[PDB]
Amino acid sequence: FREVVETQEGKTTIIEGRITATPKESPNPPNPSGQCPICRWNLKHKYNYDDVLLLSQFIRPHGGMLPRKITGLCQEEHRKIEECVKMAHRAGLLPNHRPRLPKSKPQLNRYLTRWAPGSVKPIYKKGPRWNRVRMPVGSPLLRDNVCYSRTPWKLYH
């Protein structure tokens, strides 16, 4: 990881870049030949939004996701990680990855929030039983996650 440092001296500002210490993948992945980190470490369908220890490894210091060309994630797992990161941010599980810079907003505890809180209109007219307007929960991208319960996940409530 390189960091750009700028110093203003007199009227001659300098700016350079220094390569700090970089993390290294843990030795001996359980499943070598995996084309991406997840499928290589046997995590294809065994992580959720709350697995911050996993998600943060693909996180910019301010909460943004990292590109595929850098992370090495396959497309599907990259989408899954992005959605899990969004859900974790909305649930407040990443308090040290906040946006760079605040009036006090009401504190409502959330989790498994698919949509941005400010982009969903209230369901004033829920439909009849056969056409009910249901509130999405979680993400369909995780529909294939390992299900230890007999009943599958209910992605809509």
Binding site: K125, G127, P128, W130
Partner: protein, 43 residues
């Protein structure tokens, strides 16, 4: 709000009916029984 015109289950505009996993499993079970019946009648 949310009216089904006329009578449910008969008209052109019927109340939608959806098959549950329970019903699917029941039908599959009956199909398995009938397949075994075919086998035992084939001899």
């Amino acid at each position: 709000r949310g009216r089904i015109p006329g009578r449910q289950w008969i008209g052109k505009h019927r109340r939608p009916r959806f098959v549950s996993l329970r019903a699917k499993q029941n039908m599959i079970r009956r199909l398995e029984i009938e397949a075994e019946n075919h086998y035992w009648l084939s001899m």
